Scaffold this active site. Structure first.
Site, PDB file in Angstrom:
ATOM      1  N   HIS A   1      -2.133   5.324  15.674  1.00  0.00           N
ATOM      2  CA  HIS A   1      -0.942   6.181  15.750  1.00  0.00           C
ATOM      3  C   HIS A   1      -0.974   7.246  14.624  1.00  0.00           C
ATOM      4  O   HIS A   1      -0.097   8.100  14.619  1.00  0.00           O
ATOM      5  CB  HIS A   1       0.358   5.340  15.813  1.00  0.00           C
TER       6      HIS A   1
ATOM      7  N   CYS B   1       1.980   2.481   6.775  1.00  0.00           N
ATOM      8  CA  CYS B   1       1.072   2.130   7.893  1.00  0.00           C
ATOM      9  C   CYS B   1      -0.382   2.132   7.400  1.00  0.00           C
ATOM     10  O   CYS B   1      -0.752   2.974   6.603  1.00  0.00           O
ATOM     11  CB  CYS B   1       1.315   2.990   9.127  1.00  0.00           C
TER      12      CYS B   1
ATOM     13  N   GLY C   1       5.192   5.730   5.672  1.00  0.00           N
ATOM     14  CA  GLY C   1       3.925   6.028   4.980  1.00  0.00           C
ATOM     15  C   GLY C   1       3.094   4.785   4.674  1.00  0.00           C
ATOM     16  O   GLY C   1       1.916   4.970   4.221  1.00  0.00           O
TER      17      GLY C   1
END
EC number: 3.4.19.12
Lengths: 306, 306
Positions: free
Chosen positions: A41, A145, A143
């Site tokens: 993603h 991830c 942020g």
């Protein structure tokens, strides 16, 4: 003595973290040898997350669309492939700080350390468990991830988790490092309710043995029980069923304390039925379920890492 | 979202830890530039600890009596001096992995990360507080002496603790890195009872603001109070007195949540008087006092380290 929620030392993983930017999305990657692993993603905008077609979004992406930064140095991307829900970005430089490592897919109930990162920079480290509903109860802001969860056996880092999403209830979902989600979660910004967050019975028992080793003995009762009688009480309190495999795994703590596993079950059954009457156990007024039997032994034995 | 007991990443400190052996006593040292810092009780046997004369025991010790090992490499000791309760062993090799560092003496209520070590090898990392009675509630077995506590501000490690002793009650005592004990504790195996373990009121308040930011709001009551009225209730429950300086420090959390500091005090006062009625706050059934206001902001803002 004393007993803390203890994470693995994070040094071997700190040296693997990078920043990955694709268009205007920035998150964390893991640089192991000449491959950077990150959540797929990274290729999505905020609007894409409602209903993303990853194969289609990927067609507008070339090697040069992935900016990988380690400090003030950009890695050159020489290839990219999507494996399940992770991207594998092949880079021209092998990470000089790559430790001995393995990818493992963990079972519900197993614990690991998270190195929370922002912009490829480590913020802190904490201990988590894979819950029986395949969520983790982490600490993750926008942020984070691509932060990873791991275990260490001497000198070998076992990577078991990559962070991908926050569910609307504030709990977390992510993948193993092959990109397969834990549980039924998907990388879409949609309704995905977690199931029952059941208590990890074997871990509660481990933690009660830790309490005994450390002097907290008030909860030791006069009773014993059977697996079936305990499981009938456990079910009511949303406790995971206890199996013979669980009894086996608690063997070493049984041997060290001289308290039979089924006697510790009867003590637990009394705590469930009667409560803790405002008393504490290893400074907690709840029954802690995020220590494995292995974690108790390790912390109580002083096991170290190369 | 979510809120965890989070330690600082341990990588910068892992690369500083060594093993120090003097005769048959082995413990941990900290190698910063060309100096190894360790507890002076490295020079003691088990019998010496009952009534040690450090000046006298030191006379039978030469540079070559201190074996300093970093992995499979022995450092050469070129000088030694005892400063308060630490030894400074001058070595011929400056630690190549020395980070930017400072020595700080912390105040009661301040938190820090411990890297627990055995034989100069890191076992794990956890978050602690300097208690108001100058003990810490750690996790330390035989061999853990010389493990250090630290904070990180970007790229600079502030060393604040070195581990020296376990008291008979299973709580811990140690020094700053100048070798001065926190509180009245000494490096003798004698009767040294800790005073009252009071609750760090300002930290409880910080942690309630963290709860609010994270969705746990049930405890927000309809009341306000004054510092004097709150302190009269706090004293009874062995809570540290709240000062104007504490109100000031909670200013930023006040501003972010829109809950006035004295309204959060009245909420706390109600929790103290009425209990939690079996409810939880950020998954704890007790009032947590080992997060500073700074720790809440850092974790809720995603502050990272170089």
């Amino acid at each position: 003595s004393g007993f803390r929620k203890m994470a693995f030392p994070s040094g071997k993983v700190e040296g693997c973290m990078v920043q990955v930017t694709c268009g205007t999305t920035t998150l964390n990657g893991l640089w192991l040898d000449d491959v950077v692993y990150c959540p797929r993603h990274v290729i999505c905008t905020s609007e894409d997350m409602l209903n993303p077609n990853y194969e289609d979004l990927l067609i507008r992406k070339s090697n040069h669309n992935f900016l990988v930064q380690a400090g003030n140095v950009q890695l050159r991307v020489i290839g990219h492939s999507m494996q399940n829900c992770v991207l594998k970005l092949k880079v021209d430089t092998a990470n000089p700080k790559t430790p001995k490592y393995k990818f493992v897919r963990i079972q519900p109930g197993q614990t690991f350390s998270v190195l929370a990162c922002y912009n490829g920079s480590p913020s802190g480290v904490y201990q988590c468990a894979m819950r029986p509903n395949f969520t983790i109860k982490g600490s993750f802001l926008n942020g984070s991830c691509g932060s990873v969860g791991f275990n260490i056996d001497y000198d070998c880092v076992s990577f078991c988790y990559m962070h991908h999403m926050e569910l609307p209830t504030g709990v977390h979902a992510g993948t193993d490092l092959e990109g397969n989600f834990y549980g039924p979660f998907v990388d879409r910004q949609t309704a995905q309710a977690a199931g029952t967050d059941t208590t990890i019975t074997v871990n509660v028992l481990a933690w009660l043995y830790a309490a005994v080793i450390n002097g907290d003995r008030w909860f030791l009762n006069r009773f014993t029980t059977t697996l079936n009688d305990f499981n009938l009480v456990a079910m009511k309190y949303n406790y995971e069923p206890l199996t013979q495999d669980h009894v086996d795994i608690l063997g070493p703590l049984s041997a060290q304390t001289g308290i039979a596993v089924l006697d510790m079950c009867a003590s637990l059954k009394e705590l469930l039925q009667n409560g803790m009457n405002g008393r504490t156990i290893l400074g907690s007024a709840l029954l802690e379920d995020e220590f494995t039997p292995f974690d108790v032994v390790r912390q109580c034995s002083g096991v170290t890492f190369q």
